[PDB]
């Protein structure tokens, strides 16, 4: 969160990669950075595609991943060097292996440096590696769900956000958003068929966080009430912020 117009900034399309893994993360007039990713347990693999849109080669093409001081102890990224020479119109691929150590909020920074026509081209963009990517969806009957829902003791483990919808409140879109977010989508848990209930486990090296959630649309008001309940306060916080921005 920064002050000032978010256009041509480091996170123009970051939000579009929270509930889906593929797409074009950034594109200026020389380069297009695409993404393809997959996650399992507390791990993942992200493919980064660098497309040269010009008629000439990029030289000394050097992409670097940067994780803030805290992020680093919570997220582990490993990758191999990319050939510093990218022909015009060509695409070069970089594989990033991901390991989530513990829950985190911050996002890694992708820095790209390269020479074009003899000039220094420098690009920075936030990498859409978010906490919900390490979700293991967990289907369960309504009875099980409520049993688990009422085991919350810590009031801090319950985060509720009442917000204005930033998008049309389409049902099918909303469904896809929740499924894409990562938890399982449980049917017939909330008696009101217009609401959505979710449940899943967030996987990290050191701890497994059980998470429950409830999304309540109010069509006339054009508002939502999202309710998160997990076994870890910081997890409940981060997932609520992430999901809130999607609707």
């Amino acid at each position: 969160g920064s002050p000032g117009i978010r256009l041509g900034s480091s996170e123009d399309n970051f939000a579009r990669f929270v509930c889906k893994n593929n797409g074009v993360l950034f594109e200026n007039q020389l380069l297009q950075i695409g993404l393809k990713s997959e996650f399992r347990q507390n791990l993942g693999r992200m493919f980064i595609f660098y497309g040269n849109k010009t008629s000439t080669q990029f030289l000394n093409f050097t992409p670097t991943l940067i994780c803030a001081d805290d992020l680093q102890t919570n997220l582990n990224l490993q990758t191999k060097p990319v050939d510093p020479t990218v022909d015009g119109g060509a695409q070069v691929q970089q594989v990033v292996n991901i390991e989530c150590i513990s829950d985190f909020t911050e996002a890694p920074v992708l820095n790209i440096q390269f020479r074009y026509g003899g000039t220094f081209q420098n690009v920075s963009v936030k990498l859409p590696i978010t906490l919900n990517k390490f979700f293991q969806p967990t289907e369960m009957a309504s009875q099980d769900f409520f049993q688990r829902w009422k085991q919350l003791s810590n009031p801090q483990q319950e985060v509720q956000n009442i917000f204005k919808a930033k998008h049309p409140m389409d049902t099918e879109i909303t469904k896809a958003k929740i499924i894409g977010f990562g938890s399982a989508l449980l049917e017939e848990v909330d008696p009101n068929p217009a609401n959505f209930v979710g449940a899943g486990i967030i996987h990290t090296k050191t701890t497994q966080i059980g998470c429950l959630l409830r999304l309540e649309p109010n069509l006339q008001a054009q508002m939502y009430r999202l309710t998160l309940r997990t076994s870890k306060d910081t997890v409940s916080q981060r997932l609520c912020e992430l999901l809130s921005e999607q609707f």
Partner: peptide
């Protein structure tokens, strides 16, 4: 089912 309360009044 039964959440304690409901957003939509």
């Amino acid at each position: 089912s039964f959440f304690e309360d409901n957003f939509v009044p």
